[PDB]
Homo-oligomer: A and B are copies of this chain.
Amino acid sequence: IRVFAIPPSFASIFLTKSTKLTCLVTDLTTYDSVTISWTRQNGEAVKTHTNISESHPNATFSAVGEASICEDDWNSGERFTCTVTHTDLPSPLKQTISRPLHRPDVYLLPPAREQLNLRESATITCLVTGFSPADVFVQWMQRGQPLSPEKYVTSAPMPEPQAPGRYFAHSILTVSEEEWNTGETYTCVVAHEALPNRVTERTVDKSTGKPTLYNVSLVMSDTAGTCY
């Protein structure tokens, strides 16, 4: 008996603005005639939950709702109560899931200088700091082109050490250090809900970072007040 209900995630929400909720039923009795029915807080029916699933490898028929709703219809605590009646359940088992802040801070550290002497691994670090809540999604963008999802590796939002309850996660990515001569700043696209446009992109390249050759060049004249 394992029947968990999946609340929507800002990953898919950012993907297609398609907040979705599923309450899959698993390891129950092995019978057909399985019905899926979700309800809002008025109790009314739902949309095209479809695409039947076969018996599990452990020989139990698998079924799950496919419930699309409105992003606005999620923000006031709607206990999405889904019922499933079955042959074994004259008392069908119900499932529910509903809607249960701090700004993130994103940086992008360049590789290490000693990293850039082995002459293969160009590590790059993007990051996020001190934010609430979790569920945030991140990804890296390279010239308007999302990278290989396996190319980077994403953390999970473990909580802050000293902050009251804020969150932070990480992600790391490698490339050829020979590539760390074209650079192209490898833009890491954060995606958090609590942003004015829900994206706080930042990026960093070789030319960015820190130089060790200044040349300040103040000039001085009456022939000014102009800023050509």
Tell me the A residues contacting B by CB distance below 8 Å: 214, 216, 218, 220, 223
Contact = CB atoms under 8 A, between A and B. Distances in A.
B218 A223 contact: no
Copies of this chain in the oligomer:
2
5 contacts: A214-B223, A216-B220, A216-B223, A218-B218, A218-B220
Contacts of A216: 220, 223
Nearest to A223: B214
A218 B223 CA distance: 13
A151 to B, nearest CB: 28
Q: Which 5 A-B pairs have the closest CB atoms?
A: A214-B223, A216-B220, A216-B223, A218-B218, A218-B220
Nearest to A208: B222
A214 to B, nearest CB: 6
Contacts of A220: 216, 218
A220 B218 CA distance: 10
A213 to B, nearest CB: 12
A223 B215 CA distance: 10
Contacts of A218: 218, 220
A169 to B, nearest CB: 25
Nearest to A214: B223
Contacts of A214: 223
A143 to B, nearest CB: 22
A216 B220 CA distance: 9
